[PDB]
Amino acid sequence: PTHLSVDTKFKTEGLCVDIPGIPKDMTYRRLISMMGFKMNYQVNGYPNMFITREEAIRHVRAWIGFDVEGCHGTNLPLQLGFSTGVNLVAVPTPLMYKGLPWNVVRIKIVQMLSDTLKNLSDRVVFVLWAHGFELTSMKYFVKIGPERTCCLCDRRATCFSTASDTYACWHHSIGFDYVYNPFMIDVQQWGFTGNLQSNHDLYCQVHGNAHVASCDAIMTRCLAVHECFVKRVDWTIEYPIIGDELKINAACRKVQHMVVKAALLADKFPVLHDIGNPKAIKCVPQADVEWKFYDAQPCSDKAYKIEELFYSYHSDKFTDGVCLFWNCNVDRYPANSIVCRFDTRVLSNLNLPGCDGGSLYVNKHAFHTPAFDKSAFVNLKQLPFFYYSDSPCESHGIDYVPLKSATCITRCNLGGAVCRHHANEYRLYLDAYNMMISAGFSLWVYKQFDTYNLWNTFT
Ligand SMILES: CC(=O)Nc1cccc2nonc12
Ligand SMILES: [Zn+2]
Numbered sequence: 498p499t500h501l502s503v504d505t506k507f508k509t510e511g512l513c514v515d516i517p518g519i520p521k522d523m524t525y526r527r528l529i530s531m532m533g534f535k536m537n538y539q540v541n542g543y544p545n546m547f548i549t550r551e552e553a554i555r556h557v558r559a560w561i562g563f564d565v566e567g568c569h570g571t572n573l574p575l576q577l578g579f580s581t582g583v584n585l586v587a588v589p590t591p592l593m594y595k596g597l598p599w600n601v602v603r604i605k606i607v608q609m610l611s612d613t614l615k616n617l618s619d620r621v622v623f624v625l626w627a628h629g630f631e632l633t634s635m636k637y638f639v640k641i642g643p644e645r646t647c648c649l650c651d652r653r654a655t656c657f658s659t660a661s662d663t664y665a666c667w668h669h670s671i672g673f674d675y676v677y678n679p680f681m682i683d684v685q686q687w688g689f690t691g692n693l694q695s696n697h698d699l700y701c702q703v704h705g706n707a708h709v710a711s712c713d714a715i716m717t718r719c720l721a722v723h724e725c726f727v728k729r730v731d732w733t734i735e736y737p738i739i740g741d742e743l744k745i746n747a748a749c750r751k752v753q754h755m756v757v758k759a760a761l762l763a764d765k766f767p768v769l770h771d772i773g774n775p776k777a778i779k780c781v782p783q784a785d786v787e788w789k790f791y792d793a794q795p796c797s798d799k800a801y802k803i804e805e806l807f808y809s810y811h812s813d814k815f816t817d818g819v820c821l822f823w824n825c826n827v828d829r830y831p832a833n834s835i836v837c838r839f840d841t842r843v844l845s846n847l848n849l850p851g852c853d854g855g856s857l858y859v860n861k862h863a864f865h866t867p868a869f870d871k872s873a874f875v876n877l878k879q880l881p882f883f884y885y886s887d888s889p890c891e892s893h894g895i896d897y898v899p900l901k902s903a904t905c906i907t908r909c910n911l912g913g914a915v916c917r918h919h920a921n922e923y924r925l926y927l928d929a930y931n932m933m934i935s936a937g938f939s940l941w942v943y944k945q946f947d948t949y950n951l952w953n954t955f956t
């Protein structure tokens with residue numbers, strides 16, 4: 498029960514307008530065959546072109562919505578649309594390209610998928626709302642066979658060249674002409690009433706329908722992400738390391754300790770209300786304060802309404818002391834808050850486009866994150882960069898230039914000259930901080946917060 502049996506039934510009702518007469522009784526086996534491919538009863542790690550929902554969820558980074566529209570089937574030109582916003586026109590002889598034969602179109606398809614995917618995934622998963630032309634177009638740019646490795650590396654093969662008769666991964670694919678051993682999922686098999694737009698638009702106002710192949714491709718992927726990551730959430734699914742996941746996570750731990758430790762020293766709150774992950778630990782364990790936890794799972798859909806977190810009757814008095822929202826996304830933070838809030842608009846390899854302006858942030862786990870909203874922060878200000886240490890000035894054991902900074906808040910800087918230890922630590926913390934920011938996190942704090950109040954914690 499790992500792979501999708503090719504003897505599983507495929508509902509063909511979605512297909513019968515592009516493919517009139519299609520049998521109601523249909524297997525993957527007979528569909529793959531009808532699509533022009535032969536599986537040759539092959540036990541070589543590619544049991545089925547089509548995959549389960551579970552397999553698709555584990556391979557979310559590989560998702561490319563795909564849609565084909567009859568432009569006028571062998572007779573007529575086809576519009577190919579990918580969730581990259583690319584539209585290509587194939588002739589049998591937002592980006593909108595003119596009509597060209599398949600022999601060139603297949604080259605553009607390999608280049609596009611390779612650039613999109615080489616830093617995301619070892620494969621492609623075409624995400625479909627299958628009506629027939631997409632499935633019957635695959636033979637013109639897809640070759641299948643046994644699992645293979647790259648001719649230039651140890652990564653599984655995703656592309657094939659008819660020029661050289663060789664196989665490459667996404668990294669090594671330049672000049673290759675065929676997609677090799679793609680995967681695919683038909684969203685329409687999930688049990689939906691009515692068309693794509695009627696179903697997409699239930700959940701998302703951000704993607705319109707210009708009635709072009711790339712728009713349906715985007716809607717198809719959006720609806721899929723809605724179904725697998727918004728409405729359904731699984732924090733048991735691990736995802737591979739593909740970037741700076743580990744540095745970013747370490748940075749997050751170090752900034753959080755820094756910022757909260759400073760806020761407590763600066764304003765000496767008698768109570769901190771820690772609102773979010775039910776697994777959360779005291780980020781400043783030595784701090785004098787009354788630490789009070791409130792459980793909230795990450796809101797994958799709409800931001801939490803502060804009315805429903807706080808009221809319905811705790812310390813009850815969240816207006817006492819300070820509220821810590823560390824990636825606990827609410828509509829409008831109270832004025833007495835420390836906040837980390839993920840900016841869904843960031844471009845990274847970790848952040849995939851999501852549903853209704855939100856984004857899918859994949860780092861160990863997948864977190865669909867509601868659209869970043871500036872109005873949430875109206876009672877707060879941006880938290881300026883600073884470094885604070887009360888640790889003793891003492892080197893122990895990295896070559897030096899003397900550090901000069903207004904934001905190095907230490908005894909040594911108070912004394913006019915930053916010691917080597919605090920300068921190493923300062924530069925390390927600044928690097929962590931820059932990592933986290935560029936990874937798309939944003940920091941906000943109560944308006945009264947002033948690093949000037951930290952200097953008198955040394956006397
Ligand atoms: C620990 C972790 O990766 N959590 C998160 C990252 C990005 C956005 C999030 N929204 O809630 N939790 C989020
Ligand atoms: Zn390679």
Ligand SMILES: [Zn+2]
Binds near residue numbers: 702704720851852853
């Ligand atoms: Zn959408």
Ligand SMILES: [Zn+2]
Binds near residue numbers: 890891908915916
């Ligand atoms: Zn020092």
